[PDB]
């Protein structure tokens with residue numbers, strides 16, 4: 062889930078491998094060299110504004126002759142916008158930043174979206190309060206599930222989409238539909254789980270930076286960029302920040318198998334990490350208007366923050382229940398005439414403090430244990446390994462990977478603190494293999510215990 | 519003690535002595551840049567109208583009253599009932615655009631009790647999308663101060679307002695301008711502190727529920743509702759959820775003293791509590807368009823969450839630098855509280871950057887540092903006993919506790935925690951007045967540190 066994606070294969074127009082379920086992660090979805098036909102795309106030099114590339118539908122769509130359009134400057138094409146465009150998108154700005162305008166064209170009202178990648182401007186053209194009311198229901202939501210339900214119902218009312226889901230990522234990057242608003246007659250996805258590869262790592266990475274993407278018509282063929290390569294670089298044009306970017310054929314096929322005619326998702330990003338997706342399906346082709354997409358992008362940002370805040374409160378609520386327990390222990394440690402007698406007291410329940418299966422206590426050149434632990438030789442080896450570790454805290458949810466593993470029945474997870482320096486005196490909490498991850502609160506609680514014990518002893 | 523009656527019910531004239539009792543939610547009047555109707559929730563019979571309704575709606579108030587929303591708004595009336603069902607929150611709004619002989623007309627409707635309130639104002643996505651672009655700068659902001667600066671700069675670019683401030687409330691409801699974006703030439707309010715009464719309790723309460731309010735023209739007279747009382751109840755019409763609500767005259771005077779021609783603020787609400795305000799000033803009258811107001815309401819919601827997150831990070835960063843000291847204190851508390859907590863080695867004074875400290879335990883008290891004399895301490899402790907909860911904190915003890923204003927040399931700022939219930943045992947950190955009546959504000963990290971101390975001591979002593 063946090064892993065960097067494997068490096069991309071070349072695209073099909075550069076003779077790249079055919080994409081299968083075995084090589085999902087390596088499809089270069091960001092450089093399809095093509096767009097969706099409900100809009101037109103130009104690329105232009107960031108300095109001169111010379112038009113370098115155009116989609117093959119762009120001449121017809123803008124009503125200019127191909128030869129005339131290619132080579133023209135944005136000064137000539139977009140005299141009113143060109144000045145504002147340069148100011149809004151200065152060199153080195155993020156590629157997610159966008160200049161947007163509304164044009165009159167000989168095709169009525171036309172939406173223009175511009176963004177910058179490297180030395181290249183990418184211009185996308187396409188034809189062109191209920192949220193405010195849902196904000197109360199969003200704020201009121203007493204938990205993540207309730208919030209998910211409100212979000213999906215809200216988005217469905219906004220868009221008219223036949224299905225709207227909140228898809229939540231597990232730490233292994235598998236997903237679960239935790240909420241769903243759907244048209245009567247459709248079978249429910251609610252509660253269904255899906256493998257990591259249904260949204261592969263390069264997609265999840267892309268979706269952490271570019272927060273909305275869509276397929277307007279799942280039966281429509283992509284329109285190529287001409288030339289397909291960027292003349293500046295003689296390399297593929299990055300289209301990750303372009304909403305008109307052509308969708309992965311693999312995914313479009315998957316959509317068609319689901320009888321989905323149109324699709325849209327918005328990223329839910331929490332702590333720089335992709336938490337989930339607002340996933341929308343329509344049975345029929347549907348170009349969602351640009352202004353409504355803006356609304357969904359806003360909803361995504363709001364929901365992201367609501368999750369971050371709610372999760373922070375769960376953490377704080379959990380850590381509060383470790384202070385009461387910690388106080389009991391600090392009290393005992395203050396009076397202690399021997400850490401062995403005090404800390405091994407079942408009444409103190411140092412096991413339960415960390416939701417551990419086992420605990421090793423070493424003090425005064427001897428150790429003892431509570432709960433399920435490895436046998437004495439394994440404990441001795443564990444302690445000998447610990448001595449080699451720098452710092453005063455070691456924590457792992459898979460001891461095997463860090464310390465190559467046979468202790469996994471009782472000691473798959475490990476959390477150890479030095480009570481002083483050198484690990485001559487220490488506590489080691491152990492957890493069995495499924496280990497259940499140490500909560501960040503349990504880690505800080507261990508740090509607090511280190512201080513307390515270091516002082517008291 | 520209750521709100522005073524409004525002026526049209528012969529209520530007291532509002533002064534600096536009786537601020538908190540002005541019923542700002544029932545002024546029985548609106549701002550003249552729009553029109554307001556009220557109507558029965560069931561029948562849609564028009565019950566009240568602003569005396570200017572005629573300019574906006576084309577018809578005379580007397581003529582319009584008695585007609586139904588079915589007759590007046592045939593297209594919207596069906597949708598209006600569905601959007602605002604009985605018992606819905608009063609913050610919920612139906613909105614529409616109407617065609618009128620003169621561009622268009624913006625209609626905003628909301629429901630209070632058995633009453634629908636309809637607001638009409640003239641109207642004509644640059645703003646919504648300009649917000650989208652600012653979201654990156656908001657997310658990027660590395661701390662609360664930087665976030666505050668981005669927020670104010672963003673709002674100023676959206677609106678064109680001459681000044682945009684982020685006003686943060688202390689827990690005693692005193693405030694500080696923690697960020698400011700202003701036109702060239704204006705003197706800065708940044709860092710200035712203001713007493714609780716500049717935004718009084720009933721205003722702050724209203725602002726926790728209704729998140730945007732404005733004064734379009736600070737020299738323009740409010741337009742009365744006719745009749746002023748609600749025929750349903752023979753009582754004042756709640757206008758708290760109406761953006762056209764007339765502004766408190768006291769506040770409008772304050773705005774004029776500041777050379778403010780137009781004012782708008784958005785509530786920053788964090789944990790159901792008013793955290794602060796995005797406060798906007800224009801030197802000249804300015805009706806912000808309805809669509810831009812919608813944008814600001816959205817920004818306020820977003821910023822509320824961004825503030826909570828960014829502020830939590832500042833607190834954690836601050837408390838990390840106090841961990842060694844905190845541990846020392848927790849260790850000592852785990853072991854007579856008088857002997858332990860008075861120990862200079864613990865330095866409970868320095869923990870909170872305090873000048874003084876009162877320790878009450880076992881029916882006696884003692885002090886460290888600069889403190890008031892015994893009778894003042896006894897009075898302070900007696901006042902504390904009357905306070906609800908287990909934490910009292912103030913950066914200006916005088917404003918909250920007027921009899922304690924004379925303690926300002928040693929006790930301008932106060933932070934007190936109960937170690938039992940009822941304040942029989944407590945700690946009181948004191949700070950001197952700044953070299954008026956304000957002490958250096960308590961950092962939110964020092965507050966949570968105090969809460970942690972409370973828990974530890976409460977547990978250890980029981």
Ligand SMILES: *C/C=C1/C(=C/c2[nH]c(/C=C3[NH+]=C(/C=C4\NC(=O)C(C=C)=C4C)C(C)=C\3CCC(=O)O)c(CCC(=O)O)c2C)NC(=O)[C@H]1C
Nearest residue numbers: 081082085090250255258259264308309312324325326340
């Ligand atoms: C070889 C890899 C495969 C693959 C590729 C793939 N998938 C996406 C994007 C999406 N896949 C989604 C999956 C689901 N949609 C649903 O409705 C459900 C279940 C109810 C699932 C699991 C979703 C939501 C997306 C996001 C895009 C969207 O909103 O429509 C991509 C990237 C698409 C692009 O941006 O170009 C790729 C390459 N899909 C597979 O199933 C595996 C075999």
Ligand SMILES: *C/C=C1/C(=C/c2[nH]c(/C=C3[NH+]=C(/C=C4\NC(=O)C(C=C)=C4C)C(C)=C\3CCC(=O)O)c(CCC(=O)O)c2C)NC(=O)[C@H]1C
Nearest residue numbers: 533534537542712716717721765766768769781782783797
């Ligand atoms: C004795 C009465 C007083 C009084 C009452 C009062 N104040 C408000 C509302 C506001 N006061 C604000 C204060 C400030 N604006 C600034 O620019 C600064 C500092 C530079 C401060 C301290 C603000 C921002 C508001 C909100 C309204 C707005 O956004 O303009 C009310 C309620 C107004 C209403 O909603 O009807 C009342 C009754 N304020 C005083 O200062 C004293 C004179």
